[PDB]
Amino acid sequence: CNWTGVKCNRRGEVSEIQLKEKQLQGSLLKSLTSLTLSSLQLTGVIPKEIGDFTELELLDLSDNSLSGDIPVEIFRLKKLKTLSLNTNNLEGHIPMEIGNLSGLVELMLFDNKLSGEIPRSIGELKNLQVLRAGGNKNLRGELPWEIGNCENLVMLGLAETSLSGKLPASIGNLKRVQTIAIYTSLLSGPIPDEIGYCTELQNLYLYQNSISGSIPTTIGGLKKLQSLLLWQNNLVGKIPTELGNCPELWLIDFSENLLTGTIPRSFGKLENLQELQLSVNQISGTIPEELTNCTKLTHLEIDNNLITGEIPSLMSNLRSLTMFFAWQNKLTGNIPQSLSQCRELQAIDLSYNSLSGSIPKEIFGLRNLTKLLLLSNDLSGFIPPDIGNCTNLYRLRLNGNRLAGSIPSEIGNLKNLNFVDISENRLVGSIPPAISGCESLEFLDLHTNSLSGSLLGTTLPKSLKFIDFSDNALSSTLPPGIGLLTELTKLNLAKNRLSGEIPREISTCRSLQLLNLGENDFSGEIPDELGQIPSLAISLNLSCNRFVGEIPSRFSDLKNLGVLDVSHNQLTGNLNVLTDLQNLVSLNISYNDFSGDLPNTPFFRRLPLSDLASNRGLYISNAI
């Protein structure tokens, strides 16, 4: 009887029913051996009458909307080798009677609403190979001891459940298990040493639990081990040396634990290691040279630890390295030039160490490097002209070092450079006009250097969003061409030698949220134009200049300004123009020539009386 989706046995009776990938709605022949109604958008319960098809072997109801319990009558089917209930709405416990399906091989409960514990009955399934119950948030309790009795298990996953407690020593009886995935769950206590008895173990994923204790040494006796994800747990103690004995290990992630001791030299023997993540631990010692013998390493993340010593030059041997993160350690010495022999490097972050010496020119020869982060070290010397060679550089942070000399003009050669932070160094001379050539540049932070000379509109790319030149020796006048950067969100020129009027052209920066002109030699009158920039929101700081005249009436139009500091100027007249700004939070008018009365309002009442005392005539008055 074949239309489609229906199959018959030889004797002429209906055998298999299959329907999937249709669109439907609604709730859902005693010789039928196989039943697949899957991806049908079906709703309702699973009818207990299902348990009546005695010859059932496969039942796949997966990828539907079914609700209610898993009927215990389903477990009357003693011939079932596959039960797929996954990706539905099912709730309730896994019934104890699960243990009665004596031939069950595949069991898929994952991605449901199931709750309760895992019955101690699973241990009676001797043919069980795959059990995946993960993605049930309220599946809870300890993994039952009886799990050790499923002798044929290959795949076990309980991920994203509420499973708690320590994994039972029982686990060591599973001599065929390949993948154990119980991650983003409630587990605590130590990984049991008995796990070293699981000879076929390939992938161990325990990440995002509370597991405590240390990493059992026995894990090094697992010869087929490939991926170990133990990240974000309470793990304590030293990394087992014995891990160097796992020839197939390509991924190790111990990130976010309490580990101490040293990175083991034995790792040098792992010829298949692609990825080593030790990030956020207590690891001390030096990077061992033997690590440079792992030729397939793409990812080395050792950041946020106690590692001391020098970065080894033999790092040139890792020719596949894409990512090198050593930031937040005790590293000293020069950055080795031989690191540039790793031609594939995408990202180098060495920040927050003691690195000294010059930045090696050769590192800028990397044609694939997007991210170079050297911030917070002892680095000195020039920024090499070869910086123009690093074609794909996107994010550059050299800030918090001793770097000297001028910003090399060939930086104008970099067309993808988005973000550049050179602040807090000894840089001198002018900002090079050629930087107008970085057409992608949105963030430029030069603050706290010896930068000098004048400042031009032609000197800067019009794609700029963030500008911080504060704390330098910059001089002459803020150029009218500043009005050319219409993307500028934030402009900080504070603490310089700048002078002249504020050019009215400032009115055309339509995106400007924050403007800091503080601590300069600016003079004359605050132009009316400054009030014409509705976007001014975060801050406007005109303080510690020579401004005179009165607060422009247009200032009543900055309806979004949260912070305003005009203090330490020669400003006169009264504050009446300010009285209706409802979003004004902080106001500093002190050390000016202001005079006149301010209304008695919680706003003006919060102004410190010493602030009024440093002016000419200011006082709070009471209305009649």
Partner: peptide, 13 residues
């Protein structure tokens, strides 16, 4: 749908 296995997200500065 529960997430597939993954490593610790790298974090740079």
């Amino acid at each position: 749908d529960y997430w597939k296995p993954r490593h610790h997200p790298p974090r740079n500065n």
